[PDB]
Amino acid sequence: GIFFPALEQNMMGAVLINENDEVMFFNPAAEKLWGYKREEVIGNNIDMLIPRDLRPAHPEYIRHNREGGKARVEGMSRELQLEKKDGSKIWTRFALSKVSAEGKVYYLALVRDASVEMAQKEQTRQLIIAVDHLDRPVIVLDPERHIVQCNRAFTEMFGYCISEASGMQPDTLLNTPEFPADNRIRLQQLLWKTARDQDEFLLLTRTGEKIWIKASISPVYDVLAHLQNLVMTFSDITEERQIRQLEGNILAAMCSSPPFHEMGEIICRNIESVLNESHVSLFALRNGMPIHWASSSHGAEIQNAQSWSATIRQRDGAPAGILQIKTSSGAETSAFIERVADISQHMAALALEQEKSRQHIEQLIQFDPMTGLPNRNNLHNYLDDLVDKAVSPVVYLIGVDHIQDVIDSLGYAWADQALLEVVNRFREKLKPDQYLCRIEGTQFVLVSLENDVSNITQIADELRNVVSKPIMIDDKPFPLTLSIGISYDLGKNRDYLLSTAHNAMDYIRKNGGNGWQFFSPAMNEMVKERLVLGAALKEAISNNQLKLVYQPQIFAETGELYGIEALARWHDPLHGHVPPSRFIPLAEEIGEIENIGRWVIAEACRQLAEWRSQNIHIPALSVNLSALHFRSNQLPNQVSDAMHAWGIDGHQLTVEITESMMMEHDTEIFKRIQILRDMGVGLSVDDFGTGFSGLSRLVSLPVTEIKIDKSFVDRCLTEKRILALLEAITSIGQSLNLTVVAEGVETKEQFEMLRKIHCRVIQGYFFSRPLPAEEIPGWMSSVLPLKI
Amino acid sequence: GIFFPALEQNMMGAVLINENDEVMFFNPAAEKLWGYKREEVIGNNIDMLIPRDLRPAHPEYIRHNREGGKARVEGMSRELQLEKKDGSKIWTRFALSKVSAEGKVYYLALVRDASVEMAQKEQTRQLIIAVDHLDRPVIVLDPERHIVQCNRAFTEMFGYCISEASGMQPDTLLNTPEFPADNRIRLQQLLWKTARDQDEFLLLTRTGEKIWIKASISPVYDVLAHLQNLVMTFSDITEERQIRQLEGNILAAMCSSPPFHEMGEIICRNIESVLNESHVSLFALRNGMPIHWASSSHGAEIQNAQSWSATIRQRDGAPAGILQIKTSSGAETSAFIERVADISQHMAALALEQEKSRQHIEQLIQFDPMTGLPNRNNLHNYLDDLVDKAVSPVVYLIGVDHIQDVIDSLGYAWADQALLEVVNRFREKLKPDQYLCRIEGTQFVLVSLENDVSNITQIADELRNVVSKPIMIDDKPFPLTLSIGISYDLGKNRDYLLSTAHNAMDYIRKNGGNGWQFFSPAMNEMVKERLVLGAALKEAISNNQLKLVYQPQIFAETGELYGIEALARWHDPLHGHVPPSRFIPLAEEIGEIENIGRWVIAEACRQLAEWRSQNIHIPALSVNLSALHFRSNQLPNQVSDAMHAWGIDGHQLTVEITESMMMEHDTEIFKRIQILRDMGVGLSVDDFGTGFSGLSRLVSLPVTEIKIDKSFVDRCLTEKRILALLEAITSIGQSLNLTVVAEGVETKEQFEMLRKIHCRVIQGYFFSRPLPAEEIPGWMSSVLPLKI
Numbered sequence A, B: 001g002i003f004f005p006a007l008e009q010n011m012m013g014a015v016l017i018n019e020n021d022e023v024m025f026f027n028p029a030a031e032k033l034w035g036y037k038r039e040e041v042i043g044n045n046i047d048m049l050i051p052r053d054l055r056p057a058h059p060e061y062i063r064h065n066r067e068g069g070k071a072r073v074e075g076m077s078r079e080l081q082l083e084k085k086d087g088s089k090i091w092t093r094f095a096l097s098k099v100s101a102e103g104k105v106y107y108l109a110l111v112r113d114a115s116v117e118m119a120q121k122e123q124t125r126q127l128i129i130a131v132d133h134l135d136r137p138v139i140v141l142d143p144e145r146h147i148v149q150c151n152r153a154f155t156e157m158f159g160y161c162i163s164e165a166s167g168m169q170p171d172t173l174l175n176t177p178e179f180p181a182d183n184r185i186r187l188q189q190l191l192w193k194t195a196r197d198q199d200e201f202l203l204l205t206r207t208g209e210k211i212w213i214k215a216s217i218s219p220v221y222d223v224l225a226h227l228q229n230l231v232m233t234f235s236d237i238t239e240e241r242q243i244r245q246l247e248g249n250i251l252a253a254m255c256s257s258p259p260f261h262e263m264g265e266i267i268c269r270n271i272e273s274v275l276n277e278s279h280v281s282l283f284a285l286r287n288g289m290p291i292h293w294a295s296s297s298h299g300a301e302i303q304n305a306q307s308w309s310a311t312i313r314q315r316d317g318a319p320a321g322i323l324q325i326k327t328s329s330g331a332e333t334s335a336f337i338e339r340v341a342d343i344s345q346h347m348a349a350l351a352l353e354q355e356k357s358r359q360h361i362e363q364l365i366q367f368d369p370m371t372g373l374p375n376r377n378n379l380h381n382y383l384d385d386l387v388d389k390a391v392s393p394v395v396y397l398i399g400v401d402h403i404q405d406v407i408d409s410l411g412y413a414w415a416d417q418a419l420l421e422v423v424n425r426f427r428e429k430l431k432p433d434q435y436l437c438r439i440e441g442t443q444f445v446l447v448s449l450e451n452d453v454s455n456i457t458q459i460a461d462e463l464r465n466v467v468s469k470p471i472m473i474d475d476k477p478f479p480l481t482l483s484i485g486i487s488y489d490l491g492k493n494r495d496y497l498l499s500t501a502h503n504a505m506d507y508i509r510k511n512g513g514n515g516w517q518f519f520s521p522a523m524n525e526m527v528k529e530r531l532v533l534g535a536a537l538k539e540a541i542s543n544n545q546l547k548l549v550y551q552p553q554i555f556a557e558t559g560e561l562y563g564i565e566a567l568a569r570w571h572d573p574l575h576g577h578v579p580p581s582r583f584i585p586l587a588e589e590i591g592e593i594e595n596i597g598r599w600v601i602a603e604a605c606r607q608l609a610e611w612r613s614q615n616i617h618i619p620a621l622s623v624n625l626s627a628l629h630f631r632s633n634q635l636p637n638q639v640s641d642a643m644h645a646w647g648i649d650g651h652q653l654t655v656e657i658t659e660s661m662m663m664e665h666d667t668e669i670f671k672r673i674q675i676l677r678d679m680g681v682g683l684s685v686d687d688f689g690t691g692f693s694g695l696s697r698l699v700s701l702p703v704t705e706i707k708i709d710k711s712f713v714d715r716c717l718t719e720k721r722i723l724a725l726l727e728a729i730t731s732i733g734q735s736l737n738l739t740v741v742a743e744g745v746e747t748k749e750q751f752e753m754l755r756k757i758h759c760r761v762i763q764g765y766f767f768s769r770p771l772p773a774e775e776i777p778g779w780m781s782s783v784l785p786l787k788i
């Protein structure tokens, strides 16, 4: 056989043993491997070749193999040890084989050195223990994006294992939530990115827990620039997303520049948001002495409380503030709390330094950013000037209410806009003599010089009605209210006035706000008296318990009744007799003047119908109307109704207007007068108007009568210069056919002294006091004519 | 023989070839490996076994081995590729030998399965990677303390490769500095410690500079509980401190609210400071397209450019920007680049969010959180509404300069206080119709409705005059200046108006500020001409070159001269004849009214003496005076000087006053009139008054004449109603001894129609034109009496 020397010189050392477990064949390669020679090996039991430990065990191993047979079993190639000539031990690769010839059974084992193979195995083990040491999960993927390798950190974080995850897609392996933010497409795009990339996803463990993980994919190529593998690393980011949220919230709040206390509160609550069940405190340095900035706690005692005290450093490096974090027993890692404190101190240094600079400047600042109004120091100086000038002012303290709603709904950048809108509305209505300033927060101070209750209440009502309509910001309505406190006293300092106004405003706010009040209950009760009087007047108007008293007018020469003027009168069961000089202006303030006008016109016309039933001529009847009455485009409707419902057509009715009405210039009012004048009813002007040119226009807008006021008539006795007034007034009387009326005559000498100027008619107490309608007919039939 | 069946039963495939390269031995193991049949194999050439692609190359190796002698070496045993009958490719293990038999050349080959070999090698390859990708330096130590495995992170961090660090001690590798001494003791105790341990050390690198290292050592035992290997991990301290400082600095930068490009720049320089010799670029995605955001100041390039790219996202999957960071290879470490890039992305996201929020807010803000004034949006809305209403407004653009000195001296807060003071000064003067707004910076816009040139000049002068008093801040003066551009055009839009106003303001500011001008050259020319005329008027008044003219006043009945009136006329060589209706209002605006008053009174008395030198009776003289003249407390001084210097005692002189003079109510003015009247000089009132009652009050301020306006006379015959005015006005004439003067008669019919009303005197063209003074004596002796 030509194969004898071939297997003799083959690379693998070949050892052949016969039935007797003795070596019969042996070759030079095995000589080199073991150390002994052919003459030293041939004819000896395999026991000498076996290492010493297995010496007894090897024979029964061979015997068991012989007994079993197993249809000529040859074993499997593996790795084993040798004992050399000097006793050294080496790793070798064995392949055994069983031979059966001539009924007997022989064996041969082929051996190669395995130093490289065992070095590889040691490298494998050391590399595995290097992988499974740090808790940063890494996995490897083939070109087809199938996971092929894992580690203990990954299997512990996600529950899976290499056996249940080998050779399958990573998206299919990792179950994602049901479209929370469309993260499925993001995960596929990160898997399919061809360059180094990273992303953040939301995943659930094998059990299922809401965990966010940051994944990073990197490609690794081969020598010839082909894709070889993709490695994906993961890291849990749950502890860092919350810190990102904290820094975002603090940054957003600080960009709006909130006040110091509320900024501290925001920081504290945001720290608590990331530290579950903790307590946080903030202190500032005031000349080295710590003071309390803000805090937030539930008050519950924290047993075994870990306490940390972080120090805030300014730009130069000096300490400025102290932040105390107290946490439960082992709630969170110390590095977490250290990081939170560091980021918080970095973000709070700016707040502390801006607060310090703000205090330093505001010690002496006499103005105010954010609505540009004056401030407390300016108000103090103004009030001190007023006090030393000895002029007692009226102080209104105004608190704007419901601003916290917009603060919590939109933010400080919009609360400021609401304040600006309110201040602009106030500026749109402030009078020249009023002083407006801002003291603190949502509080403002108005200084006025009106020492009169009727004007003070009007100013307060106007101020409260300023905010009647909602404020539209960012296309969102926001109804705000006002609480006003009013203080006015004589000889009082700034402190007394400010304290009283603050007390009034605080009482209104505590009771519910949306209103105004005085101090000084004695002055407060007058408002209740006025409201009850006005309610009684309105009730009387509605119930028609009002009256008309008629005073005649007489001629100078013939002593004949020129006409009468109807005057409104009122008597209440509770308030007695209310003079018309009192309750007519009261109706102007309320708004019942129109109701008065309709009643008087209807009653006066109806009374003329009653007098016409019997024999009474009554040439004319004068009825007073107010300026606010004539401002409406409804007068001819009711007046025409009066005439044609009782046959009192306008040649008998007469209407007199106030002097101030001609002072005003309204085209619509004048046209209504001209329409009314053309109907037949006359027009009369009291107080002789204002000027000849105006009365010349009153000649253009035709009238019939001119009335000389009582004050002018009374002064005619002494002031001899005003005689030409009546002479000129009467001159226009016959110049263009006007009837002049003398009012308030009281003595005979007055009647004779106005006779020479030729006053057309005379109306006064020298002839008759006003009389109730039930004896108007008696007066006509009794004294007519009179002494002339 | 007995070895051929043994060779057949060898479980490894065995083949043997000769010079002819035929296969003579193909055992069942080889059958199971390849798949070919024994008959198909025996006698064939190697070509039915050689791989197809290596077929062109194999005969070259055949020739090399068959010709070149390699000392009859067996060869090499290694892994190789086999293709199955179907075509699949597997890897097997080959051992080849060269045997010489019968003087010939024979080649022998043994082949295994090697499936597990493939698995082991591929897993080693897959596992060395993801050791090379762990972010921290981990090294595995054998029990006898020799480094066996070092990862890529450690390799690039310290600079000691695997070849240099294989089988040698960690202290000898990372030799620490001799100073201090305790380092060696500490590191030996750490290295030979058997428990998990951590510490800090001062290890040294191949190239130089010190690195402070946190070192951790952990053990790894075996099944039999003996130290099998140990693991050591390293971390750096300077790097983590730098990351913390970077995050803090960028957060502090954001909290101060800088602009977008400034924010990008500060981020860029922070990354530059934390990472040496790098270039950083930022792009922001607008409408899906990137735009440059910030870049390195060093615009050049550095060799060995390694680039890292990050995608800035914003709370969603939508990309928001791109970051590129480039650094030279070998300068720093991959983990440091990872960390800096990640933190930069997470901070730039906040920067982008803040920019977006600020832009959204500013798009809708309607007021100013500073000075409280309206802002550019409100101004735009106002101008748009006015243009839609089709009313052309006058736009003043005001720039306040000399404000940098306040910033340099005191600071930003005091600059804001000065700006507030200026705005308050504007508010204390703006009229109800005008509209004030702040656009930006030290610039404001005023909108007015009056389009008169004189009114605009008055408004501009008033605006410029308010800054004359220096701003008192902290008891320190601070002068400022105003540059005002006036734009006014018909039918133009707000863009054109604002552009023209800004052009004018910039022109003034560049030329030096402290002034105002129109945008229109024609308007500038008009202003220049008016100023030239005013200067000419002042020069003429100073150079006594004015002249007076006298218009006779005649008696209605006797045709005898009642008196004459002096009127001032001005003649200029350049401007010709300027009517008094043109240059008298100009004197009021300038301030020459007083000078005109003295000249007229002094000249009239001097002229009165000249007429009295010869025989002229001249019963009276009427001299016009202005209200502003009478408001000065000096009138009796010069007037009394006039009488006693020419013997012209007030029984002749007469002063006529404007109607508006009696409209005003000043006690000092009224007293001065009474003092003046008591001297003997008469008083005349033109255009009557607001009311005849005022004339009755004026009775206490004795008057002698009343003048009827020309407009009333010119409309007398057309409007028969105004006849009563003259009838009443004359009636007052004999009521209290007054003379009525009719001014402006032109025809005989007008004169006779005023005769029935018995007007006392007549002054008009029907009798005589205003006569120059040289022929007054001739007119007296030639025409009088006119005999009607």
Ligand SMILES: Nc1nc2c(ncn2[C@@H]2O[C@@H]3COP(=O)(O)O[C@H]4[C@@H](O)[C@H](n5cnc6c(=O)[nH]c(N)nc65)O[C@@H]4COP(=O)(O)O[C@H]3[C@H]2O)c(=O)[nH]1
Pocket (backbone or CB within 6 Å): A551, A566, A567, A568, A569, A579, A580, A581, A584, A596, A600, A624, A625, A626, A743, A744, A745, A746, A763, A764, A765, A766, A770
């Ligand atoms: N000492 C004195 N007084 C005399 C003399 N002759 C008349 N009087 C008084 O002069 C007033 C005339 O009313 P008036 O001047 O229009 O001024 C009226 C008018 O302005 C207002 N008034 C009265 N009735 C009405 C009404 O129905 N409507 C309106 N709108 N105002 C009314 O009330 C004012 C006061 O009315 P009365 O209290 O009735 O006071 C009456 C009357 O009593 C006299 O010789 N001596």
Ligand SMILES: Nc1nc2c(ncn2[C@@H]2O[C@@H]3COP(=O)(O)O[C@H]4[C@@H](O)[C@H](n5cnc6c(=O)[nH]c(N)nc65)O[C@@H]4COP(=O)(O)O[C@H]3[C@H]2O)c(=O)[nH]1
Pocket (backbone or CB within 6 Å): B551, B566, B567, B568, B569, B579, B580, B581, B584, B600, B624, B625, B626, B743, B744, B745, B746, B763, B764, B765, B766, B770
């Ligand atoms: N067409 C016409 N005009 C007639 C007639 N009768 C008089 N006049 C004009 O009436 C004016 C009289 O001056 P005035 O009414 O006080 O109104 C004067 C006065 O307000 C002002 N003025 C003139 N001289 C002086 C002066 O020395 N001082 C002041 N302060 N104002 C003066 O100039 C105004 C008018 O300028 P004059 O040219 O003086 O206009 C003169 C005169 O020309 C007539 O029948 N027909």
Ligand code: HEM
Pocket (backbone or CB within 6 Å): A015, A017, A046, A049, A050, A051, A054, A061, A062, A065, A075, A080, A081, A082, A083, A096, A107, A108, A109
């Ligand atoms: C340094 C030399 C040797 C070592 C270290 C060694 C070791 C071992 C050991 C530990 C076993 C136990 C079972 C196993 O591991 O599969 C075994 C099995 C066996 N050995 Fe050895 N052996 C050596 C030499 C030989 C030789 C030259 C033969 C020649 C026939 C032989 C015959 C056997 C047989 C027949 C089995 C039975 C395997 C079975 O039944 O599965 N041993 N060997």
Ligand code: HEM
Pocket (backbone or CB within 6 Å): B015, B016, B017, B046, B049, B050, B051, B054, B061, B062, B064, B065, B075, B076, B080, B081, B082, B083, B107, B108, B109
């Ligand atoms: C799948 C089958 C085979 C493969 C992949 C293969 C591959 C190679 C390669 C790459 C070489 C270059 C030298 C080296 O790598 O050591 C080589 C050389 C050689 N091959 Fe093969 N061969 C194959 C089949 C065979 C067979 C069946 C024989 C039978 C004798 C053979 C005999 C030789 C010899 C003698 C050399 C010379 C080695 C030297 O001179 O370094 N080859 N073969």
Ligand SMILES: [Mg+2]
Pocket (backbone or CB within 6 Å): A624, A656, A686
């Ligand atoms: Mg009345």
Ligand SMILES: [Mg+2]
Pocket (backbone or CB within 6 Å): A686, A687, A709
């Ligand atoms: Mg009256």
Ligand SMILES: [Mg+2]
Pocket (backbone or CB within 6 Å): B565, B624, B656, B686
């Ligand atoms: Mg005049």
Ligand SMILES: [Mg+2]
Pocket (backbone or CB within 6 Å): B686, B687, B707, B708, B709, B710, B743
């Ligand atoms: Mg005149």
